[PDB]
C-alpha cells in the first residue's frame, strides 16, 4: 500500500519475511501434488539474489 | 441573594502530625527523657478519657424509631447510580453503569437541593428507588496524593540558603499568615514557583520543609503520575486534581519533575506522543486559562530548564524563577556542621581542610562523606572519627565524576 523503496522506512523485508518462506513451504521443497505457481508483478525495487 | 449557597457548606481537613516538634536537647540528656514522658502522660490520658467515653454511656434510644425503620426501609445491598434528568414530581430518571435507565421515584428524606445531573446517587435492587445521594465521589487515585504526615525537620534543618528561603516564604507562608500587607497596595501574591539548578542541591528538601511548617493542606505529584493510556484518562485526572484542591482548604500543590511534562510543544509523527502532548496542554488551561484560579499555589521543580515549553515559563502562570547553585566556601561550613550534629567527633579534625582545598561538590556529596567516614570508624574498630576517616572518605565519594576538561591552553 503506497510505494516500495530501498531499506529505509517501511519498504523492508515485509515481503521477504513471507516471500522466502513461500518458495520454501508453498510448493517445490515443501509441496503437495505438483501445484504450479506463476509469479507476476511489475514494481519491484528490492529482491532476493537467491531468487 | 447576596450569599448564595454560603459557599458549599465545606470545612477543611488539615494534617494531624507534628504533635510536639520540641525535642531540642538533641542528645542523650534527661530533658528528652523528661519531655517524652510528658507526651506519654497526655496521650495515655487521651486514651483513657475516650475509653471512659465509650464506657459510661447509658443512653439508648437507637433512632427514636425514625432512622431505624429508615435503615430497614433502604435495602441492605445499597447500590450506586447516576442522575440524567430531574422530573420533579417525586419520580425522576436515573442511569446505571450499563446505561439502563429507570423511572424511579424518590423515597423520601432527601432534600431536592443538592442533586444535579452528574451527582451520583444511592439506589435499591428490588425497586431501584432513590434512598440517598453519594457524596465526595473522589476517584481513588487523587486521594493517594494527599499528604498526611510532616516528613522531616523545619527550615533549621538545611544548611544555609537564606536568600532563596526568603523568596519562597514571600509566596507561600507570608500571604497565608499575614495578608494585611498586600491590601495596602492591592497586589496579589505570586502563584507559580520554579525550582531549578544542578542535581543534589536541595530542591526536594525545600518542599518537605514547607510541607512540615504549614497550615493548609498539601498535595504531591510525582512526575509521570497523571499519564494513562485510555486517550482521555490523562486530562481527566488533571481536572479532578485541581477540583479537590479547590474544594478543600486554600492549599498548595507540589508537582515535581516537570521536565517529563513539557518540552517546547512540537508536532510530530507518533500517535501516542499526542495524548502525552494534549494532557500537558490542558494543564496550561486549568492553571491560568479561563476566569478564575482560587487560592491554589503551584510549586514545580526540574534539573534542566531550557528544554521546557515557553508557554509555561511566562508570568501569569509562574512568577518566580529560583536558581539553586552549587555552594560556596562559607555556607558549605553549615552543611558539614549540621550533618555532623549527633556523631562523636574527635578534636583532631578541622572542617576547613576539605572545604578550602577542593572547591566543587554538592550538598548531597557532604551527606555521603559523613556517612562514609562513620563507616570507616567501625571498619577499624572505633567510635570517634578523626581526620584519617575524612581523608579516605573524601576520596571514595568523589571518584564518580570524570577526570577533567581541557589542557593548559588557557592561562
Amino acid at each position: 500500500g503506497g510505494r516500495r523503496f530501498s531499506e529505509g522506512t517501511s519498504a523492508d523485508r515485509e515481503i521477504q519475511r513471507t516471500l522466502m518462506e513461500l518458495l520454501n513451504q508453498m510448493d517445490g521443497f515443501d509441496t503437495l501434488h505438483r501445484v504450479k505457481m506463476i509469479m507476476a508483478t511489475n514494481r519491484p525495487d528490492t529482491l532476493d539474489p537467491a531468487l | 441573594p447576596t450569599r448564595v449557597g454560603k459557599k458549599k457548606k465545606k470545612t477543611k481537613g488539615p494534617d494531624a502530625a507534628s504533635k510536639l516538634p520540641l525535642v531540642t536537647p538533641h542528645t542523650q540528656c534527661r530533658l528528652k527523657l523528661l519531655k517524652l514522658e510528658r507526651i506519654k502522660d497526655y496521650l495515655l490520658m487521651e486514651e483513657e478519657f475516650i475509653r471512659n467515653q465509650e464506657q459510661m454511656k447509658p443512653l439508648e434510644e437507637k433512632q427514636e424509631e425514625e432512622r431505624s425503620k429508615v435503615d430497614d426501609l433502604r435495602g441492605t445491598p445499597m447500590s450506586v447510580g447516576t442522575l440524567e434528568e430531574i422530573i420533579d414530581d417525586n419520580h425522576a430518571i436515573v442511569s446505571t453503569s450499563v446505561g439502563s435507565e429507570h423511572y424511579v421515584s424518590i423515597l423520601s428524606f432527601v432534600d431536592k437541593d443538592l442533586l444535579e445531573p452528574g451527582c451520583s446517587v444511592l439506589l435499591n435492587h428490588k425497586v431501584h428507588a432513590v434512598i440517598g445521594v453519594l457524596m465526595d465521589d473522589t476517584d481513588p487515585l487523587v486521594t493517594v496524593m494527599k499528604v498526611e504526615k510532616a516528613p522531616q525537620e523545619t527550615y533549621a534543618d538545611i544548611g544555609g540558603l537564606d536568600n532563596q528561603i526568603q523568596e519562597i516564604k514571600e509566596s507561600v507562608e507570608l500571604p497565608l499568615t499575614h495578608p494585611e500587607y498586600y491590601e495596602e497596595m492591592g497586589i496579589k501574591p505570586p502563584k507559580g514557583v520554579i525550582l531549578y539548578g544542578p542535581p543534589g542541591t536541595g530542591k526536594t528538601l525545600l518542599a518537605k520543609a514547607v510541607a512540615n511548617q504549614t497550615s493548609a493542606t498539601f498535595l504531591r505529584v510525582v512526575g509521570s503520575e497523571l499519564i494513562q493510556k485510555y486517550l482521555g484518562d490523562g486530562p481527566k485526572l488533571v481536572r479532578e486534581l485541581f477540583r479537590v484542591a479547590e474544594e478543600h482548604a486554600p492549599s498548595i500543590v507540589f508537582i515535581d519533575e516537570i521536565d517529563a511534562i513539557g518540552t517546547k510543544r512540537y508536532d510530530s509523527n507518533s500517535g501516542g506522543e499526542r495524548e502525552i502532548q494534549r494532557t500537558m496542554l490542558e494543564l496550561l488551561n486549568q492553571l491560568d486559562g479561563f476566569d478564575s484560579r482560587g487560592d491554589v499555589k503551584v510549586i514545580m521543580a526540574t534539573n534542566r530548564i531550557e528544554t521546557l515549553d515557553p508557554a509555561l515559563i511566562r508570568p501569569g502562570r509562574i512568577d518566580r524563577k529560583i536558581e539553586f547553585p552549587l555552594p560556596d566556601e562559607k555556607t558549605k561550613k553549615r552543611i558539614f556542621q549540621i550533618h555532623t550534629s549527633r556523631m562523636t567527633l574527635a578534636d583532631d579534625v578541622t572542617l576547613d581542610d576539605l572545604i578550602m582545598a577542593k572547591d566543587d561538590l554538592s550538598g548531597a556529596d557532604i551527606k555521603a562523606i559523613c556517612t562514609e567516614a562513620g563507616l570507616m570508624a567501625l571498619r577499624e574498630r572505633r567510635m570517634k572519627v578523626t581526620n584519617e576517616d575524612f581523608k579516605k572518605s573524601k576520596e571514595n565519594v568523589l571518584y564518580k565524576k570524570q577526570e577533567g576538561t581541557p589542557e593548559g591552553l588557557y592561562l
Binding site: 517501511s10 523485508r13 519475511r17 521443497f29 515443501d30 | -
Partner: protein
C-alpha cells in the same frame, strides 16, 4: 478439573511432520564440523553421563559463520531430524520492527516458551543484523536497536536458567559483532566455514548425482 494446557500463540515448533525433511548423511564432507556441532548439542542430550564423569558442564552456545551458501542452514535442518528435542528456528529480522517495546518482548516470548518446554534448540538464523554496540548512541531509535542485545544477554547468561536450553547462531564475518557476546560461558563454540576445497567438490558432486 484442569484441562491439558496448550501454550499455543506464537508457534514455531518444528515437531513431528514436519521437522526433518533430511537425513544426517546428506551433507557432503563437513566432517570436522559435523563432528563439532554434534559434540555440543547431540552428545550432551543423550550421553549426559560422560560430562558428569569428568565434571565438564557441557557448553551452552555455538556461533557459526561463513560465506553465504556454504551449507549453514542445512546443518541446522540435519540436527532437527536425528534429535529428540524441541527445535525452534527464529529469523533475526521480525523483532527489529516498529512499536517500541515489542522487539525485546519477542525475545522473552521465545524463552518463556522454551524453558516451559522440553530440552530444546533455539536456532537464531541471522544476527548479521543487530549484534554490535561499539558506540554510545546519542540519537533516537538506535538505543532501541542497542537494547535488544541487552535483553538477549540478560536471558542468555543472566541468572542460572540452566536446564537443557541450547542456542545456535549463524552469520557472516564475526569481527563486526559485540565482544560482550564472544566471551566463553555464553558463546563457547566458534566454527568457521570454508567454501569447499578440493576433496570436497568431489563429495558434493557425488552425493547430488
Amino acid at each position: 478439573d484442569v484441562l491439558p494446557p496448550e501454550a499455543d500463540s506464537s508457534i514455531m515448533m518444528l515437531t513431528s511432520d514436519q521437522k526433518p525433511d533430511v537425513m544426517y548423511a546428506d551433507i557432503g564432507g563437513m566432517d570436522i564440523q559435523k563432528q563439532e556441532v554434534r559434540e555440543a548439542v547431540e552428545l550432551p542430550l543423550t550421553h549426559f553421563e560422560l560430562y558428569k564423569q569428568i565434571g565438564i558442564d557441557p557448553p551452552r552456545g555455538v556461533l557459526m559463520y561463513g560465506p553465504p551458501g556454504c551449507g549453514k542452514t542445512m546443518l541446522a535442518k540435519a540436527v532437527a531430524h536425528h534429535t529428540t528435542a524441541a527445535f525452534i528456528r527464529v529469523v533475526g529480522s521480525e523483532f527489529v520492527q516498529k512499536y517500541l517495546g515489542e522487539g525485546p518482548r519477542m525475545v522473552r516470548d521465545v524463552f518463556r516458551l522454551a524453558k516451559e518446554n522440553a530440552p530444546a534448540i533455539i536456532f537464531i538464523d541471522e544476527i548479521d543484523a543487530i549484534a554490535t554496540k561499539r558506540f554510545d548512541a546519542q540519537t533516537g531509535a538506535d538505543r532501541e536497536v542497542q537494547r535488544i542485545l541487552l535483553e538477549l544477554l540478560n536471558q542468555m547468561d543472566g541468572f542460572d536458567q540452566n536446564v537443557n536450553v541450547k542456542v545456535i547462531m549463524a552469520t557472516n564475518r564475526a569481527d563486526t559483532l559485540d565482544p560482550a557476546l564472544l566471551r566463553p560461558g555464553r558463546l563457547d563454540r566458534k566454527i568457521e566455514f570454508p567454501l569447499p576445497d578440493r576433496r570436497q567438490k568431489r563429495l558434493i558432486f557425488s552425493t547430488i548425482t
